């Protein structure tokens, strides 16, 4: 109904609650009435430039099919979270499942 590909990256110092943080978020999509069709993780990556005097962050992408209220609450949680550091969404009209790339190399 309203798909959203959201890529969220988080502070490296707190790159251990991210394993549980998604369950603090995915928790919503079911009682809203939506389904996640993809979730990946390639966190602890190198930054291109300094974002509040850091150079590394833990990345995570996921797809969501939720209502407006779920979007509002998740973005408000991002806004008032101390880690947050970055957020962005790519609302699309389809579904994608097959990861993003992982590493095609050995």
């Amino acid at each position: 109904m309203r798909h959203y590909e959201i890529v969220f990256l988080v502070h490296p110092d707190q790159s251990e609650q991210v394993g549980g943080m998604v369950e603090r978020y995915t928790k919503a999509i079911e009682e809203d009435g939506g389904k996640i069709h993809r979730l990946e993780d390639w966190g602890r990556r190198q930054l291109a430039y300094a974002i509040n005097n850091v150079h590394k962050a833990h990345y995570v992408l996921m797809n969501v099919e939720c209502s407006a209220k779920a979007l509002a609450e998740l973005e408000d949680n991002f806004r008032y979270n101390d880690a947050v550091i970055r957020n962005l969404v790519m609302r699309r009209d389809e579904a994608v499942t097959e990861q993003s790339e992982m590493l095609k190399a050995e």
Binding site: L47, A48, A57, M90, E101
Partner: protein, 62 residues
């Protein structure tokens, strides 16, 4: 672009995105690579999105 690999390209295959960025982080004009107008148009915004995510740099100096 047209034969097999991705009719529409997202900002995902950085192996393709980095092929279209100059050594100083600028975007290569279409007349140099010889690509098409539609693909250049979507490729520019793909690079901008990837660049905001701090995957790619604004400037090579920074």
């Amino acid at each position: 672009f047209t034969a097999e690999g991705v009719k529409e390209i997202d900002y995902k295959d950085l192996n393709t995105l980095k092929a279209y960025v100059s050594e100083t982080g600028k975007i290569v004009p279409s007349r140099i690579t010889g690509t098409k107008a539609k693909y250049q148009r979507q490729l520019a915004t793909a690079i901008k999105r990837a660049r905001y995510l701090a995957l790619l740099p604004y400037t090579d100096s920074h």
